[PDB]
Amino acid sequence: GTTGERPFSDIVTSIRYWVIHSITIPMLFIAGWLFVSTGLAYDAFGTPRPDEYFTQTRQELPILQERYDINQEIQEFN
Amino acid sequence: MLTLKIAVYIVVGLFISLFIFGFLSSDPTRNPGRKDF
């Protein structure tokens, strides 16, 4: 029945497991929190913040139309 | 129209009376298990 690995019900009912995870799982939570709250996700993925959907010189949808020079196209779209 | 209405009322009432009187006529005992109740 057991393929060789420690059973999960044994693992998650241990003191040492929860000593390691009481730290790892919340601190991964705060790592995702600081990814969003420091604003790094916007710069990493190119997602507009709520005030860069439209700029003062572009009020329409910035639909890409270039096929190869899209970097300059996104730049002049801002 | 009145004749069709009377005929349909009679047919529907006869089938509904059949249904009711059949389920009143010891339908629990019409089973292959224990028919005492």
Binding site: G1, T3, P50, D51, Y53, F54 | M1, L2, L4, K5, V8, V11, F15, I16, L18, F19, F21, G22, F23, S25, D27, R30, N31, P32, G33
Partner: protein, 334 residues
């Protein structure tokens, strides 16, 4: 001994080739009536003024329809929820014009399928079976009652019930989406989960049982001849099927008890279809699917579209063109 008891024994007989029963004494007349009127109306009914605006819709084969476009058209919006039998019409032609065949077919059909569910219980009781096949059949029954009865009641007209045809069903679905946003309703999503998962699990069950068949035939004949009707023994290796499926995903995701597996196979699409029947039955009262239209705004306040906004553009295009001549006021209140 008595004539009535002899009739009761014939009615409840398990030796009838088609079981009748007391539910069958209501099922057979209603279903035969609905079948005969549906066939006659689908072939040769004259056009029906479904919207109650003197704009009759040709539904039958003799009036220019094919099989796909043919329908028994729902009764007139002028009738509404009013009971419209033949004897309430001044003539048969008036009855046909106002959509009386739809009311006749739908009412006898709904009684017949409720009696089919009762008859399924009845025969399970006479055969010494467990009784809950009728519970599984109550999910298609609830869906049929939702689209033929409950949605007309909530909308206030039998003209809003699903038409008895293929293209009429498509018309019902498209108008449903434009008005209730059924795709965004989670009960319809649960229904899609029910039918997609039911087909998935049907394919899984069938493929695992066919995969683990015990060798009882040569390579020439069909493998189905490895099973004899009424054999005591199992025709397939469930332990082999479980070993395969608990290595395909992992060990504890696979059923080993066949009874739990078959209860799951019954319960999943039945619960999904129950939920989608209740979704249609609750959009009868205009509790509609999610409205996320203009949910995202920028910091100035301008609307940033999502896929729900494009879906709403499609819904508007479906709505402004539906029943094009029936609306006189700015809002489609029902």
């Amino acid at each position: 001994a008595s004539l009535w008891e002899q009739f009761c024994q014939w009615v409840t007989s398990t030796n009838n080739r088609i079981y009748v029963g007391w539910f069958g004494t209501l099922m057979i007349p209603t279903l035969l009536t609905a079948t005969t009127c549906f066939i006659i109306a689908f072939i040769a009914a004259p056009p029906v003024d479904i919207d109650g605006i003197r704009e009759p819709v040709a539904g039958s084969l003799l009036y220019g329809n094919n099989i796909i476009s043919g329908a028994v058209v729902p009764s007139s919006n002028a009738i509404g929820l009013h009971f419209y039998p033949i004897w309430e019409a001044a003539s048969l032609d008036e009855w046909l014009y106002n959509g009386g065949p739809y009311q006749l077919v739908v009412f006898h059909f709904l009684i017949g399928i409720f009696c089919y569910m009762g008859r399924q219980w009845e025969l399970s009781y006479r055969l010494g079976m467990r009784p809950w096949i009728c519970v599984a059949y109550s999910a298609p029954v609830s869906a049929a009652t939702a689209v033929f009865l409950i949605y007309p009641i909530g909308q206030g007209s039998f003209s809003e019930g699903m038409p008895l045809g293929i293209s009429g069903t498509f018309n019902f679905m498209i108008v449903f989406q434009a008005e209730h946003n059924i795709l965004m309703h989670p009960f319809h999503m649960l229904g899609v989960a029910g039918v997609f998962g039911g087909s998935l699990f049907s394919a899984m069950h069938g493929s695992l049982v066919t995969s683990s068949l015990v060798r009882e035939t040569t390579e020439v004949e069909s493998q189905n001849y490895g099973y004899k009707f009424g054999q005591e023994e199992e025709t397939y290796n469930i332990v082999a099927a479980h070993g395969y499926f608990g290595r395909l995903i992992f060990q504890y995701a696979s059923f080993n008890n066949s009874r739990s597996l078959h209860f799951f196979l019954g319960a999943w699409p039945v619960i999904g279809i129950w939920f989608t029947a209740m979704g249609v039955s609750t959009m009868a009262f205009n509790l509609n699917g999610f409205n996320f239209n203009q949910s995202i705004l920028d910091s100035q306040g301008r609307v940033i579209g999502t896929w729900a906004d494009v879906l709403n553009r499609a819904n508007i295009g479906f709505e402004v063109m539906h029943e094009r001549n029936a609306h006189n006021f700015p809002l489609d209140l029902a």
